[PDB]
Symmetry: C2
């Protein structure tokens, strides 16, 4: 049998944020069985906590209902928060396919309520399909350059001139399906405070509550395009329009040509706990 918890990542209130199922003591499960369990659960992701193999605290394997992922933000944040119930350590080193990711855990009375991660440093370039993407979103132009970032998944960013213009988007999801192996992240805001919406046929989601692997890239995007400085944190509120508000905090240190750290943080809360029969 295995115990699991469901964590709503990037939220402090259950039914907000983005759920992940975290399965403990998973070393007896072959990967094909982990994949079947992730399919059974049908959450965006299920993760599995394994013994470490390179000096970290644990090895985490991440599965959607259909495949394994090398890196994912909200699922790793939820896993780190879940593992709080089982360690006293202030820092947690989680091994993944992209290497060991360092987390700082934040507690109140023994309960981990939030965590911060250092993400893989992305790469980026211009999308080069702007008219096609804009048509699919139903708008004429972006504010800032339309650029696509890679840190495992790929995330394209399209800027809107106001929060209301962002909420008014009703994309043609069929048209968006021509954009393979990426998520489309539309954003608006000013200063410290930004709003986002994410759409991805390629990743099997009509609209995502909290895209944790897009938060680091967005901070970089905003700094490069002069809306914040490198080293300044931003608050990104996602998922409001779909009723799953999610608050992500991000900061990118260094400069565009030499990034030294990309930090993403948020709250997490337990929605449920259970046991499975295998």
């Amino acid at each position: 049998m295995h115990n699991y918890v469901i964590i709503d990542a990037f939220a402090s209130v259950p039914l907000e944020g983005n759920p992940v199922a975290v399965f403990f003591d998973a070393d007896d499960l072959p990967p094909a069985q982990m994949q079947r369990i992730a399919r059974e659960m049908n959450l965006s992701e299920s993760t599995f906590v394994l013994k470490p193999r390179n000096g970290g605290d644990a090895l985490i394997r991440i599965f959607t209902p259909v495949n394994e992922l090398p890196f994912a933000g909200h699922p790793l944040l939820g896993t780190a928060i879940a593992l709080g119930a089982h360690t006293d350590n202030h820092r947690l080193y989680l091994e993944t396919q992209m290497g060991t990711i360092a987390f700082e855990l934040e507690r109140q009375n023994g309960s981990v309520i939030a965590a911060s991660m250092d993400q893989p440093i992305p790469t980026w370039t211009a999308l080069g399909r702007d008219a096609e993407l804009l048509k699919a979103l139903g708008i004429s132009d972006s504010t800032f350059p339309i650029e696509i970032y890679h840190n495992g998944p790929r995330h394209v960013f399209v800027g809107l001139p106001s929060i209301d213009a962002l909420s008014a988007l009703h994309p043609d999801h069929r048209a968006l399906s021509n954009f393979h192996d990426m998520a489309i992240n539309c954003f608006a805001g000013a200063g410290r405070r930004w709003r986002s919406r994410m759409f991805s046929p390629a990743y099997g989601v009509v609209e995502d509550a909290a895209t944790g692997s897009a938060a680091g890239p967005l901070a970089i995007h905003l700094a490069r395009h002069g809306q914040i400085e490198f080293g300044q944190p931003v608050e990104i509120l996602q998922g409001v329009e779909i009723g799953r508000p999610s608050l992500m905090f991000a900061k990118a240190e260094g400069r565009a040509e030499q990034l030294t750290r990309v930090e993403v943080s948020g709250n997490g809360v337990t929605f449920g706990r259970g046991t499975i029969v295998l």
Copy 2:
């Protein structure tokens, strides 16, 4: 807090069949909150066990992640099996939007391992879009007439000349998306033993493991088209190609013009059990 179980319906082995989450003691939950919980879980359906209002044993409300349903086969079968852990009764009367559905529970040593339901009697007519549907499925013709049945959801049936021809189907799901408010059920077999595959963009599933509300209609279809008699049971094995084999048993009594009973039965098994925080 609420307790729940995950039942794999139309299976006796966990990770086979079609999952449903069953939430107990749900009378304190407003429907908008039931809908939010069903969305959180993201299973094809979550059900909620409520006090009866018209003389049954319980009232069951059925939700997909996006809406409430009046009737659904695999979710009601799973609910009846789950409720076995909480009653000694041989029969269970479950109130729904389509009225009270009678279940017979089958136990071994106190555990309910299977159940039989009397389904709403469907109606049917020719689809009248045969060339369009056949093109979408990638085939030239059906064996038997292409007819669409209604018992809450709508189910169209297209016959294939062999089980291998059925397994070879690779439908164009975009083309299938032009068929609104229905599921497409392709079938093959002979005598007592049939195979099916179900596809439905309209109902949010690429391919379904076990379509319980299609089993009763299929028995009627096979009887009307002379492949079985009215009153003769069939075994329908679904979901083999997607690795979620599901065994459904169905029988239609009477004659086409005066159906007296449509029975569907199957096994169910618990995959997991848990508690949520609201």
